[PDB]
Amino acid sequence: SCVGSLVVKSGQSEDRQPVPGQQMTLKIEGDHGARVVLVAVDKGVFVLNKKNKLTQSKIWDVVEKADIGCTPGSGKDYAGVFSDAGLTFTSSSGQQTAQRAELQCPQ
Amino acid sequence: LFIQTDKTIYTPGSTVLYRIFTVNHKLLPVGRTVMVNIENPEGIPVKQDSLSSQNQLGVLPLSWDIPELVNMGQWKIRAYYENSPQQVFSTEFEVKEYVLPSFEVIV
Amino acid sequence: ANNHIRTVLKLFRTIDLDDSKKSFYLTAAKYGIQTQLREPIIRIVGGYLPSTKLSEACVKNMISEVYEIEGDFYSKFSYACEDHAPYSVECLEDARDDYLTQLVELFKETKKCLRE
Amino acid sequence: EIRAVLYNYRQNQELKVRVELLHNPAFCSLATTKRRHQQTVTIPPKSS
Amino acid sequence: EDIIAEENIVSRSEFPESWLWNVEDLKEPPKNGISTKLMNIFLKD
């Protein structure tokens, strides 16, 4: 779920269904200082083509797929564990992780 | 960059309005210049433009008026930051001959 | 409950916006007034038992107010929107919001006269 | 004193009720087997 | 009769596929860290 919290609902509590040419009040509950951008779109266009819609799940999927890690936990040893996490650990004595020279994780 | 287009299907001779959010790796607004180009299915860029997100809170509203004599199919919008042109973000909108359906069918 | 309806229809037929003005502006203004002052008060007036008496005084007040409202909308559409080109369709779009807002405020205020 | 409370819940329709207290041999009131007690009232919409 | 005249009826004309292309800022004072803005939109036809 998103870092902040945005939700849109109607100022009129229940009333009756709206009518073409009748005004309506939208209540927006967002964090202070934020800037919202609005778009109102018919549902026929979504009947015809419902692909490439924007939603929070897509954003989180895109953020997650660009991670540095490679395995959800543990490894062969400390060097493997750190590299799997996505870090480097170099000590004066010499214990340092294996070098990485490729952006995408293997297989 | 998270391209948002208001609709998902446009008739020829109609105007497309889209937005280009600009965020950094922590999902915060950032001021950097972007490049956007709109390419028909033959992969031939049509409109080239450059913007800056400075003093805009990372929201760049834009527009384009689809030419009357165009090819149908999946058009694409490609946007990328100026510094790193290797990473390209895209979103597809479809140009088609349609009239809005009156009802939805679910299977 | 129909004689009152025919009366108020006779009142809104006496409205007059001059022809010399542009066609889309005329349709915009007339559609605003029709959807904001002719549907709701026709709905209200349709629900009076016939013995009840109307009050055309506030209806003619309604019409005088809608004349000045339309005049202000036209003045804002032709002169005020200096941010855009004059006589522009999107200038009309910008001014239509507050035109209908003022108009609904007028209807809300004048809903308390239809009964004697 | 007995009160009859008439409700009308039409959104915009004024109503014309004709209430009536039927005669009862037990009590005593204006109702009689010869003459009937009728009030013809008017109920504004969404009003009691 | 009990019919609306032809000239009096005015037709719905705006049928936009997508409208309300607006950007707004939440500058109202915050309560419980959650601001609330009421905005007025006139529905299309």
CB atoms within 10 A of CB D29: 10
| Integer CA distances (angstroms), A83 to A67, C96, C111, D2, E26, in order | 12, 62, 74, 88, 43
User: Helices C56-75 and C3-13 sit at what angle, rounded to 10 degrees?
Assistant: 30
Closest residue by Cα to residue B22 from B45, B52, B48, B49: B52
D14–C43 CB contact, under 8 Å: no
E21–B6 CB contact, under 8 Å: yes
C39–A23 CB contact, under 8 Å: no
A45–B92 CB contact, under 8 Å: no
Distance of CA A6 to the CA centre of its chain: 14
Q: Which residues form the domain of A54?
A: 2-65
* Min Cα separation D25/chain C (Å): 36
3-state class (DSSP) for residue B23: strand
Q: Which of A36, A48, A53 to mutate to test the interface with E (most CBs of E within 10 A)?
A: A36
Q: Is the CB of residue E45 less than 8 Å away from at least one CB of chain B?
A: no
B100–E18 CB contact, under 8 Å: no
User: Helices C56-75 and C89-110 sit at what angle, rounded to 10 degrees?
Assistant: 160
Six token digits for residue C7 = 């009366």
* Cβ-nearest to A49 among B19, B27, B94: B94
3-state class (DSSP) for residue C102: helix
d(CA C2, CA C25): 32
Q: Is the CB of residue D45 less than 8 Å away from at least one CB of chain C?
A: yes
Maximum Cα–Cα distance across chain D? 41
* Cβ-nearest to C104 among A19, A20, A23: A23
Structure determination method: cryo-EM
Q: How many CB pairs under 8 A join A and C?
A: 12
Apex A20 CA angle, C102 and C4, nearest 5: 70
A54–B2 CB contact, under 8 Å: yes
> Which DSSP helix (H) or strand (E) runs through B61?
strand B59-65
Residues paired with B94 in a beta bridge: B9, B74
Distant-in-sequence contacts of B90-94, Cβ < 8 A, 24+ apart = B90/B3, B91/A52, B91/B3, B91/B4, B91/B5, B91/B18, B92/A51, B92/A52, B93/A52, B93/B5, B93/B7, B93/B8, B93/B9, B93/B10, B93/B16, B94/A49, B94/B8, B94/B9, B94/B10
Closest residue by Cα to residue A2 from A40, A54, A55: A55
Pairing assessment for the beta strands B2-5 and B73-81 based on DSSP bridges: unpaired
Give the side-chain half-sphere CA count within 13 A for D2.
6
Contact predicate A10/A23, CB 8 Å: no
B7–A50 CB contact, under 8 Å: no
d(CA B23, CA B104): 36
d(CA B17, CA B46): 16
| Integer CA distances (angstroms), A58 to A2, A22, C38, C68, in order | 12, 35, 47, 52
* Cβ-nearest to C52 among D10, D12, D14: D14
d(CA C52, CA C10): 18
A53–B2 CB contact, under 8 Å: no
Q: What is the CATH number of the domain that holds A56?
A: 6.20.50.160
Question: Are C and D touching by the rule of 3+ CB pairs within 8 Å?
Answer: yes
Chains in contact with A, where contact requires at least 3 CB pairs less than 8 Å apart: B, C, E
Overall residue count recorded for chain E in this entry = 45
d(CA C110, CA B37): 54
Structural domain total, chain B: 1
Apex A35 CA angle, C95 and A54, nearest 5: 100
Six token digits for residue B8 = 């998902």
Considering only CB atoms, which chain C residues are within 8 Å of A21? 31-32, 35-36, 39
Overall residue count recorded for chain C in this entry = 116
d(CA B34, CA E30): 33
| Integer CA distances (angstroms), B89 to A10, A30, B3, E12, in order | 35, 27, 8, 40
* Cβ-nearest to C27 among E2, E5, E10: E10
Contact predicate E23/A38, CB 8 Å: yes
Q: Is residue B48 part of a domain?
A: yes
Q: DSSP label at A60?
A: H
CB atoms within 10 A of CB C48: 22
> Which DSSP helix (H) or strand (E) runs through D18?
strand D18-21
Q: DSSP label at C42?
A: H
User: Helices C56-75 and C23-33 sit at what angle, rounded to 10 degrees?
Assistant: 140
Q: Residue B40: what residue type?
A: N
Q: Which residues form the domain of B11?
A: 1-100
Which residues are CB-contacts of B58 (< 8 A; sequence separation ≥ 6)?
Answer: B21, B22, B23, B29, B30, B31
d(CA B2, CA A87): 28
A21–C36 CB contact, under 8 Å: yes
> Which DSSP helix (H) or strand (E) runs through B59?
strand B59-65
Q: Tokens 């007036």 appear where?
A: C45
Contact predicate C109/C41, CB 8 Å: no
Full DSSP string of B24-45: -TTS-B---EEEEEEE-TT--E
Closest residue by Cα to residue E18 from B66, B18, A6: B18
d(CA C58, CA C41): 12
Residue in E with minimal Cα distance to B17? E21
Which residues are CB-contacts of A49 (< 8 A; sequence separation ≥ 6)?
Answer: B8, B9, B94
Q: Is the CB of residue C102 less than 8 Å away from at least one CB of chain A?
A: no
Contact predicate C73/C93, CB 8 Å: no
Q: In what order do the strands lie in the sheet with E37-42?
A: A8-10, A23-28, E37-42
Residue in C with minimal Cα distance to E6? C13
Contact predicate A6/A28, CB 8 Å: yes
Q: What is the CATH number of the domain that holds B12?
A: 2.60.40.1930
Contact predicate C7/C48, CB 8 Å: no
Closest residue by Cα to residue C77 from C64, C86, C69: C86
Rg, C-alpha atoms of chain A:
24
Q: In what order do the strands lie in the sheet with B59-65?
A: B2-5, B15-21, B59-65
Six token digits for residue E29 = 């004072």
Query: What are the backbone dihedrals phi and psi of residue A11, each rounded to the nearest 5 degrees, phi first?
Result: -65, -45
